[PDB]
């Protein structure tokens, strides 16, 4: 029940020898816990989930749970390529305390990931999941959009409670909110760049990589939008566009981690094959933040 | 000066023998004149401008002028592939009474249409145009987005007064409004599907193919947005999404003309190579309107 | 009848004041006439046809005719966006001496350029053309591939004698040769980069921008391929790949004109909005030629 | 050393309860062993590797080894998203008898999979692999092409012996063969559809899903190409284009498995989320084979 609100999709910190740094993870989460988030999204794209072993994925979810108040929502990335693997991942993450499973669309075989394929995959996971399911569409990583007709069909399932859409197409989001209006189905935006427009069209939250460093600003944007302060919402939204692009489509996770370092959080390195930013990328990353008055 | 408001991009009617039907054009414009539009956009993509001879393009603009109150704005599509041709088209359209020139990005050589190329093309047209210039970005027809840095540079020109963006990317629109905030530069949305989100991010109007048949609804959406009625704006916006897609990306101009017939306007045929809708397309077109309560 | 062989798609030279330089055009054509080409392709993409007035397009075709032996084939680019305009352009170009009309696919309304639309457009032009018609598919400029099923249907027309394919997909070319094997229908490659593979799959020629400067090399590649010298064909083909990309997808017509200058032909400027190469582009253009031993 | 020749990328058979059917796998491999292949490619895209557990991936490679003559080459798909995971997978597959590791490009974070990222990933795997490494580029699944400059750099590594390219762009393949001519680096085509053109440009083999059912035909195409029988090679190549597309881009693995059933091999079901073909897809699959005289 109820997923409305702002979540940072949390990173996975690593040591100099590429192990998971649970100390730093815990430290970062205590800092982020100060912000009026609804909870944490663990092992979204931003958590480098493809780079973790099965049991790292489990242990990460468990530690996040232990570093959170119990009244905060833990949305766990349990998607795998295969339907059966996904079910098992979802069950095990429920067991270490996830409140909901966020399930990315299988996409290695886009060619054959039709509506019917995606509908079946999600229906089976929802049928067998002990926790509610959130659809997760993120085309910049997957090359695929969960189609609208599939979303509408899936919204009817009692154990499918909403979706996070990362495509940034507000017409699509609007259409989804409209077409699922008769269902218990809540739409979360997938980044801080199009949060305002999303609320305008009926989304009731956002999972934003940018809230790892500008949590208060992102939460302020939520408050302005829910409160009808659209004029101030606009000024704030505008100033978040470039920093948001900076840590998402422009420089990705290495950009996010670098910005985290600069803001006093533990950003640290990514796992190979992800690389450090070149000096020119660092420079450009700094510009997107400083020229919008954030650094 | 001042381009804010709603415009229908008007179609060009043709006779059974594919001539321009100026009688029907005039009849349609008298009907559309009843709606509180800011004016008419003539020879946008929706006017089938690529299919008209030089002098048809001129005569169409002239007739529209004669069928309009003088206090209504006539934005004329004067873009051609070559910079020099564009200048000449812009001058001649000024002479038959256009208030502003809407100039589509040259796109046959996308490969070489860099920022500098587009900046030069527009600077020359703006330098030599007797009327103000509106940038026109429509990737679904062109395969190219006028890049943001080019838009920002061009917004500084005294004779470039805004742009119509048809891409539907509200983050991009937001960014443009933000980055040009210090200039006289007004942003118009390029369709009724993302009108609300556009106003939210700072656009001050829309050129909407859908206003050829639901003019009052589109104008109502404008009123709700300017008036802070965001909740009602939403309900209305949602109901316009599918009919809007129906006459734009789904069925294009033949879809628009068919819907016009059904609403009692003169829609008529397009010029070859455009074709009639198949019966199944007609059926689907009807569904998008009837299931949203418009027909 | 019979379009097999190599053609350079000829450029249109311009003066310092952007007029058509017919003197330079004639001079270039006398030089290119030395090579064993089948003829000239006039007003392909490489002739900047979108940038010319109606009557420039006509006069260019007429002058090329006058500078050619009558036993050489003049393929004239007569495509326009509208079916009727295309017919008229085709008729008038026949009158100034074109041997065949090369008709680019209308593409401003890709969305509605279905197979049936393209089939009708071409059937009408072929029905009314006094000269044979060659289908012209060039997606890098158009954003569309003439679909295979349309090509097969059109190959059955008595006045449609082949196609130039510029996409570079040899599986598609192979399929087309196979599926039209029962018809009089000859396939020309659209660039020197994939000429060898094209001959291997059944194409019987090429229209190559690169033959404006390496005519003898391109003709040599033809000779090696027709003669079964596949091993030497390979060595030669390899050395043509980068210079070919240099004057096509990398630097386009400005790249071609620059290379023409350097080889002693008249390259000259393009019409705005096309721009000169930056010094770094010039440098890279030089590298693609020098490191493959051509300059 | 030496990877030239034809390989079928073998499927993974499953039981009615979605277990790996090692009996059927072994039976299929004994049948395919009759054809003059160079060996087997195990856990390419066609083996549904993303759908298998770690130890299934290992056990599959081990069983294939046991069902093969030792003089036949086993190329094992050991790629994972993370560089470290890939190293471990490569080591363990070497241990169960793989002759070479075929390593797909990590692609979940395309945005950050630059040349340098891909160069580092492959250099580390090649540095630590006990067996030679084959680069694997398959954009239809990944959304990314291993860039040419990266391929050229990697070809210099002593433990990187070639690549399988699945993109079908023969200009790119030609360029790669040319640019790596000074290295020990062999290029394999990624499908039977562009095998002939590949040999023409310098590839020395193919990994072809189609050889699971038309092994003798694919091997015949190899023989005709190596033997200079280009005219017969062409006739044969043409007839393989549609059946090849049928079991790859059109209907994928379910299409391949269905065709396998019809040819008397064990095709069987895929793992969810992959679905059965609809009756209309089955029909179309049958057409692509029957109309080319194969069924
Ligand atoms: K539900
Ligand atoms: K201005
Ligand atoms: K024919
Ligand atoms: K090597
Ligand atoms: Na709902
Ligand atoms: Na402004
Ligand atoms: Na033929
Ligand atoms: Na080599």
Numbering used by the authors:
A (entry chain A), B (entry chain A), C (entry chain A), D (entry chain A): 33 to 327
Please give me the paper's original passages concerning this structure:
A 2.5 Å resolution dataset was collected for the native apoenzyme at the National Synchrotron Light Source, beamline X25. The final structures for the apoenzyme and Schiff base adduct exhibited Rwork/free values of 21.2/24.6% and 19.6/21.6%, respectively, and were of high overall quality, as indicated by the refinement statistics in Table 1. Interestingly, the packing of hHOGA within the unit cell supports only one molecule in the a.s.u. and a solvent content of 75%. The crystallographic symmetry, however, does generate a tetramer that rotates up the 3-fold screw axis, resulting in large solvent channels.
The crystal structures of the apoenzyme and pyruvate-Schiff base intermediate complex are the first for any HOGA enzyme to date and reveal a tetrameric structure composed of a dimer of dimers as well as the identity of active site residues. Residues 26–259 form an (α/β)8 TIM barrel domain, while residues 260–327 form a three-helical bundle at the C-terminus.
